[model samples]
Target: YKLICYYTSWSQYREGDGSCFPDAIDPFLCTHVIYSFANISNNEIDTWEWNDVTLYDTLNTLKNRNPKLKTLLSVGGWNFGPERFSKIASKTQSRRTFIKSVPPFLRTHGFDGLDLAWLYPGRRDKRHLTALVKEMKAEFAREAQAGTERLLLSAAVSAGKIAIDRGYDIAQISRHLDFISLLTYDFHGAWRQTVGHHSPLFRGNSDASSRFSNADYAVSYMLRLGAPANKLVMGIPTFGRSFTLASSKTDVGAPISGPGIPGRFTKEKGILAYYEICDFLHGATTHRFRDQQVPYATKGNQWVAYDDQESVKNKARYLKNRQLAGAMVWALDLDDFRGTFCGQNLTFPLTSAVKDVLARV
Candidate 1:
């Protein structure tokens, strides 16, 4: 029951003092710190800084601070999209180039492994993805056999029907990587032109399509597609999505107004990414939805949807019930420093709460 705390290069707030490592050492809760998006080659990787520090320095300092912590470099993200993936995966020459470049990059930066996050891989072409993963795995195996430490290999995948249908061959891909991270959040958002659940066990309305928003369905789809439950890691968003109140009548095709609404932002939207809504929670108005087991807040014209302690507890129970591998947060920096977002300051803390719940399972 390992809990991974994911971090993105562009997260708004960060603990610049390098204290996250020492502060978290005693909890023994977070097993890994996944640094997101180290492979947007077209962009200036060096220019993409966080907490006023470069990615290379951050990895080095974090690794040196906590030698026990496993650090992974994530490539691609929602913003990166899927345009160039086929080019990289279409030929052995490009694959070889990637493998050769990554090891040196990892060595130079002091990272422990790689996490591929090609959003919709098979959407473009099935054979390309299959060949890409196989080649990458082969390259990794060669490196490991030649005396490189066991470098972790993982992939972040979409948890929906389209992914299930057009994504890479699950069985073949799973066999090569350490595990597949299933993104289970973003079930509903302001983008849909209606108010709905961000991560719900069931649809909030009868008209809502059951095709989306079901965590169990996503998990079952992966397992049925040949991914071992033990090798499947469930993803939980630290933030929620929002929609216009007028659009709430319909359960689909809502539009988003970026981040930050009210109760929805904090409770429904999840936690503010160090920037967005973190400073606005003090005076924001809130409303709780019992059936959905989450909350939302409103301020001016914005509405935000997010999860709270109770909702997270229920989610933990769901994870345990499924006997899945474990849970992974999108990013660690978004957590409330005092756990106030959960209604009480618990001694065990959020990360520990997840670990404890998973341990019971």
Candidate 2:
């Protein structure tokens, strides 16, 4: 089983140094740590900022402490958007330029692989993505044969079947990469104008109509599309997705205006750090929506749908019994890394629960 965690480069802006940087990571807990987001430049990925190089160096040293720990550089996330990806993936010259540029750059930085976080490739551009991956994998194999270490190629894809239908040729996709992580959350958010589990494992009564969304359907559909079970890892949130209800409605179908209150530490609206959520959940009433296989809490009109300890365990057990690959956390920093913020004051309370159950497989 693999327990991969994402280490965001900009965490220093909030936590003020190595305390929230790579040094704070529990090196013993995860098998791989993927460095979050390097921007794409002229078909090649480049450091997004001056200090990104410095952060890269510090993150690599984490390997010294735990030689078994592997690190990867993730390029083109939600923030990077999809235009550059379509441009690069569409042209043979651009694809070749990007592919040729990666290995040397990755080797120099001490990164083990590259993870593509392109939000979604359009339906018409499917062949372009296929060529991109096919070429990338070939390049990686050539690097390994030439006596360098094995360079891995992986992608972060969406959970929606509509997006998947448009973007991927699953069996073709499965063959080219090392593994795939499906972003199973964000099914509904502030845009929906209502409350719903952002990462439901099963269908809730509130779903009320289409059998399309939810983690279970996403997983089963991907496999039906011919994705290998062992290469699939479920993406779980360490933070909560929240909304502000419009009226007194508090349950799943409540109307909403926009994101819920932001976290003091994370300073991001519509989401709360697991640590801050711990405090929010402390005195507030939280309900386990068993039909949906998750939990939520409401304070005044603020409603947050997130995975607590019980839900995390439920997810882990689901993966284990299904014989799927292990879990991945969106970020390590969002959890109560220092252990003092949450109610129990326990280090990685949500993370520990996930790994404990995943270790069962």
TM-score of each: 0.80, 0.96
Find the candidate with the highest TM-score and give its number.
2
Global lDDT of each candidate? 0.63, 0.84
In model 1, where do residues sit more than 4 Å from their true spots?
A: 12-27, 40-57, 60-67, 189-191, 247-271, 274-292, 337-352
User: What's the lDDT of the predicted structure labeled candidate 1?
Assistant: 0.63
lDDT of 2 by residue, 278-331 (tens): 889866778878887989998888898888888988988888887788888888
Give candidate 2 regions above 4 Å deviation: 15-19
User: Which candidate's lDDT is highest?
Assistant: 2
lDDT of 2 at 165: 95
